Design a protein around this nucleic acid. Structure first.
Ligand SMILES: [Zn+2]
Ligand SMILES: [Zn+2]
Ligand SMILES: [Zn+2]
Ligand SMILES: [Zn+2]
Lengths: 77, 80
DNA sequence: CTAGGTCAAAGGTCAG
DNA sequence: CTGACCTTTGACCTAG
């Protein structure tokens, strides 16, 4: 699992914010926290986050980052 | 100038789908791939694609995107 | 090692 | 439908 992103399942580049994640999910989490962005799900808050469809819903991607254990506290100034 | 669209000769906004192209040819290729659109040439499949006449034939514009090297694979899934 | 920065190249919108 | 004009993504690098 050291090699697989816990959020989308892409090739993981190491532990980012306490979770094994790809460069994509790391960057997304970083921008969300830094810019203090709020998202909305156009569906039923159960969108599938995988390599191909991770960008389909920002709300569901962020909730998966949190549920997998990504720490807001680990994003610095 | 090395900032020329390989499809139509308009000012290129960078590399789109592996080819130096204008914002017009980028959008056109994207919509064609996304919707899986099939076009028809009303002539002999050799219409001239340039800045002025790019919109004259959808079929010939798409065949030039492909012949120039535009990658169907580089068009990602819809986001909304 | 993993934190942050960068910027080319993806994405999107909506007036015409 | 088109394309000007805009935003977000993620591969890659470097400093701590
Ligand atoms: Zn990921
Ligand atoms: Zn969702
Ligand atoms: Zn063009
Ligand atoms: Zn034609």
């Amino acid at each position: 699992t050291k090699h697989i992103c816990a959020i989308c399942g892409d090739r993981s580049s190491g532990k980012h914010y306490g979770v094994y994640s790809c460069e994509g999910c790391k960057g997304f989490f970083k921008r969300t926290v830094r810019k203090d962005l709020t998202y909305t799900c156009r569906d039923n808050k159960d969108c599938l986050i995988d390599k191909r469809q991770r960008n389909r819903c920002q709300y569901c991607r962020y909730q998966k980052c949190l549920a997998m254990g990504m720490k807001r506290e680990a994003v610095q100034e």
